[PDB]
Each structure stands twice: as C-alpha cells, then as structure tokens.
Amino acid sequence: LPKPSLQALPSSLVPLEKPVTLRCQGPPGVDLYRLEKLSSSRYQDQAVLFIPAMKRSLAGRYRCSYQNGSLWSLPSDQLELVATGVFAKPSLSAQPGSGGDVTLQCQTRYGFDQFALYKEGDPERWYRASFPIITVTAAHSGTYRCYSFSSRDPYLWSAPSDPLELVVT
Amino acid sequence: SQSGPLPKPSLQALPSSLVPLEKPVTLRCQGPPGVDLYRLEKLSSSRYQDQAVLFIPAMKRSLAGRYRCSYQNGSLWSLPSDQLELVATGVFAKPSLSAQPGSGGDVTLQCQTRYGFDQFALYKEGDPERWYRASFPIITVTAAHSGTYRCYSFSSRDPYLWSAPSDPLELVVTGTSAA
Amino acid sequence: GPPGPPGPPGPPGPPGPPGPP
Amino acid sequence: GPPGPPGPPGPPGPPGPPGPP
Amino acid sequence: GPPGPPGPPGPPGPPGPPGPP
Ligand SMILES: *[C@@H]1O[C@H](CO)[C@@H](O)[C@H](O)[C@H]1NC(C)=O
Numbered sequence: 001l002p003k004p005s006l007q008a009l010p011s012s013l014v015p016l017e018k019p020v021t022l023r024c025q026g027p028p029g030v031d032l033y034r035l036e037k038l039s040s041s042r043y044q045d046q047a048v049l050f051i052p053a054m055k056r057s058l059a060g061r062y063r064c065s066y067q068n069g070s071l072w073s074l075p076s077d078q079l080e081l082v083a084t085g086v087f088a089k090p091s092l093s094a095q096p097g098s099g100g101d102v103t104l105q106c107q108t109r110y111g112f113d114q115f116a117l118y119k120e121g122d123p124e125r126w127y128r129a130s131f132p133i134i135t136v137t138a139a140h141s142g143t144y145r146c147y148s149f150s151s152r153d154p155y156l157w158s159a160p161s162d163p164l165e166l167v168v169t
Numbered sequence: 170s171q172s173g174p175l176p177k178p179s180l181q182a183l184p185s186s187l188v189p190l191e192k193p194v195t196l197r198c199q200g201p202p203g204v205d206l207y208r209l210e211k212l213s214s215s216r217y218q219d220q221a222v223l224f225i226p227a228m229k230r231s232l233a234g235r236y237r238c239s240y241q242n243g244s245l246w247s248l249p250s251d252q253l254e255l256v257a258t259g260v261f262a263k264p265s266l267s268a269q270p271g272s273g274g275d276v277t278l279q280c281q282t283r284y285g286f287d288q289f290a291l292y293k294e295g296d297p298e299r300w301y302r303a304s305f306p307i308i309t310v311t312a313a314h315s316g317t318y319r320c321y322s323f324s325s326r327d328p329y330l331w332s333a334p335s336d337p338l339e340l341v342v343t344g345t346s347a348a
Numbered sequence: 349g350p351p352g353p354p355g356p357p358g359p360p361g362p363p364g365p366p367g368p369p
Numbered sequence: 370g371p372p373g374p375p376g377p378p379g380p381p382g383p384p385g386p387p388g389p390p
Numbered sequence: 391g392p393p394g395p396p397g398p399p400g401p402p403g404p405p406g407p408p409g410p411p
C-alpha cells in the first residue's frame with residue numbers, strides 16, 4: 001500500500017513560538033491515518049498536527065502512514081522538524097575561495113560543530129559543514145543565510161544570520 | 170479527574186508457560202481488586218474472551234503463541250499486560266543433551282537432533298532458572314552454575330512449537346560446595 | 349417490557365504499523 | 370421491548386511488528 | 391428484549407519498535 005506524503009507548513013524550519021502544521025496525505029477516503037514522532041514514541045490517529053507555538057521538545061523526526069482495511073501503508077519519508085531561534089544568530093561573511101568558488105564564513109560565539117547555509121529562491125540551494133567554512137562551487141548571486149547548531153541536539157538551530165547579498169564574477 | 174492510564178495487569182500461566190501437548194494450563198489475568206471487566210486475548214488472531222481466566226484442559230498446537238490481557242474501569246481501558254509466551258512442548262521427539270567441558274571456566278553443551286532445527290534453548294533448574302539461546306546446537310555457557318540442565322529444539326517458523334525436553338544432564342562444577 | 353442490556357465491549361484493535369528501520 | 374444498544378469500544382490493539390535493518 | 395451486539399473495534403496499537411542495526 002503506497003506511501004503517503006508528510007509536509008510541514010509553512011516550513012519544516014520553525015522559529016520558537018511560531019506556528020507549523022504537519023499534514024499526512026495519502027489516497028482519498030482511507031480509514032485511518034497514523035502520525036508519529038520517533039524519539040518520544042508519542043503518536044496520534046489523525047492526519048493533521050497543528051503546533052500553534054514551536055517548542056524545543058517538539059523538534060525531531062516525524063513520519064506517518066495510513067491504514068485501509070486491516071493493512072498498513074509503507075511509512076512516509078521522514079520529516080525533519082527543526083526549531084530555529086534556539087541560539088543567537090551567527091554572522092555570515094563571504095570571500096573568494098579556490099578557483100571558481102566562494103567561501104562563506106558562518107561566525108559564531110559558542111562552540112557549534114554544524115552549519116547550514118542557503119540561497120533564497122525556487123529551488124533553494126542548501127550546503128552543510130562541520131567547520132564554520134562552507135565552500136560553494138560555481139555559486140550564484142543571491143540572498144544567503146546561515147544557521148549554526150550542535151550535533152548533540154541536531155534539531156535545535158540558531159536564529160538565521162542576517163542576509164548576505166552576494167554577487168559573483 | 171484522573172492522573173494517568175490505569176496500570177497494567179499481570180498475565181500468568183500456571184503451572185507453567187511451557188505446556189506439553191495434552192497437559193493442562195491456566196492463564197490468569199490479575200488487576201487491582203474491584204475491576205469491572207477483564208479482557209484476555211491471543212495475538213495475531215481474533216480470539217479473545219471477556220474473562221480473567223482461560224483454563225486450557227489439554228494443550229494444543231493451535232493454542233500456542235502470544236497472549237495478553239487488559240481490564241476496564243467503566244469505559245476506560247487499562248494498559249496492556251506484558252505479553253505471555255505460551256509454548257507447546259512435546260511437538261517433536263526430544264533431543265539428546267551432552268556436554269564437553271572446556272578448560273576456561275565454561276562448558277560447551279550439544280543439543281543434538283536428527284532434525285534441521287535452527288533454534289535451541291537450554292535451561293538449568295533452580296529458582297531463577299538460567300536460560301540460554303542459540304541459532305546453532307553447540308551452546309557455550311560461561312561461569313556455569315552446578316545443576317540440572319535440559320534442552321529444547323524448535324524451528325523459527327513456529328517458534329512456540331517446541332520439542333519434548335531432553336533427558337536431564339547433571340553438571341557439577343567442583344570446589345563450590347557449602348562445606 | 350423495557351429495552352435490552354448494552355452489548356459487550358468490542359474486539360481488540362488491530363496491530364500498529366511496522367516500526368522504523 | 371427493542372434490542373439493547375451496541376457496547377463500548379474495544380481496547381487499543383497490540384504493538385506493530387519490528388522495523389527492518 | 392435481547393442484549394445488544396458487540397461494540398466497534400478498539401483503535402490501532404502503538405507503532406512497532408525500531409529495527410536492529
Ligand atoms: C480501501 O479498501 C476498500 C475495500 O475494502 C476499497 O473499496 C477502497 O478503494 C480502498 N482504498 C484504497 C485507497 O486502497
């Protein structure tokens with residue numbers, strides 16, 4: 001029985017105290033939906049979870065499936081629900097790197113050992129690193145932002161940096 | 170108002186959860202005094218009853234498997250009990266239990282059968298029974314206590330349908346008396 | 349005479365779904 | 370008189386099977 | 391009159407535990 005989709009709306013990156021809705025969606029008219037959070041082993045017999053205000057304890061991995069007749073579906077793609085604004089924003093700078101590359105430095109006061117950088121748009125481009133140094137091969141002009149976090153709590157992220165407006169030649 | 174779920178009952182097979190074919194066994198669900206209604210069920214089937222006790226006068230192959238129970242207070246259902254594993258023994262001819270001692274605190278025990286079973290279970294009598302498990306017949310027990318050892322063979326296909334128990338083997342580790 | 353007694357409680361629910369890998 | 374009402378719901382079902390490796 | 395029919399099934403059970411490594 002084919003897998004349903006699991007979406008977080010408006011985003012799976014959710015600032016603390018801001019809203020998010022998790023929606024499980026399979027074929028229409030099925031008997032029952034099951035939505036679960038993996039770390040806590042707490043789940044519901046409903047397709048939709050509205051989170052009115054995001055908390056650190058709600059961040060983590062979610063999945064869902066549906067039941068029709070007695071049979072269960074394959075589970076959804078894991079939904080990575082991240083709480084942002086848990087820490088002070090980092091500050092983002094950019095320099096030329098090796099060859100046709102741009103090196104973005106995601107600066108942070110704390111000892112963080114994970115960094116995620118993105119360019120606004122459709123589609124978004126994402127880049128990950130453990131060093132606060134993210135090289136980007138053939139980068140595009142755009143509005144870049146970085147998030148810093150710890151690998152011991154990988155779903156609690158900082159506030160996003162201020163945007164860096166990059167132009168590349 | 171209520172602070173949480175109603176605690177689980179116990180589920181017990183007496184005299185034992187290892188029941189030879191045709192021998193009796195009683196499954197008793199037990200919750201707190203004053204319970205409205207018990208529900209005893211067998212897993213992976215639609216068999217269940219609305220009574221604390223199930224007396225099986227003669228064990229059958231079809232009655233082996235996993236069981237649980239819960240109770241009700243009004244419309245509210247308790248937490249489920251720990252799953253009882255009800256095993257039918259004497260379903261295959263018994264194995265032959267030997268032991269080669271290995272000079273390093275441990276003992277290797279052969280639970281041999283003219284059969285191609287991929288699961289073996291070895292136990293020692295005495296209050297806490299000391300159980301041991303394996304995918305192969307040769308099981309190695311470390312720091313083995315003196316006592317009466319028997320073994321069982323079964324197939325993972327029907328993991329609640331066990332052989333008859335082997336004839337006992339008396340292990341005596343020397344220098345451990347109460348004298 | 350009056351109505352009938354309420355019926356017995358329904359059967360156990362089905363299994364949950366297979367767990368995560 | 371008429372038949373009695375349908376009984377209350379059954380208990381929650383058991384755990385699902387374990388996940389693959 | 392007669393006693394009522396059995397109630398509806400209980401809700402599905404918890405998810406299965408996580409698999410081995
Ligand atoms: C659900 O099951 C019923 C038959 O039991 C069938 O009529 C219906 O089309 C099924 N739907 C899906 C999406 O499988």
Ligand SMILES: *[C@@H]1O[C@H](CO)[C@@H](O)[C@H](O)[C@H]1NC(C)=O
Pocket residue numbers: 175201202203204242
């Ligand atoms: C059942 O619940 C009531 C309160 O709702 C309590 O007074 C009573 O002791 C409970 N008994 C059991 C056995 O759960």
Ligand SMILES: [Cl-]
Pocket residue numbers: 011013
């Ligand atoms: Cl975003």
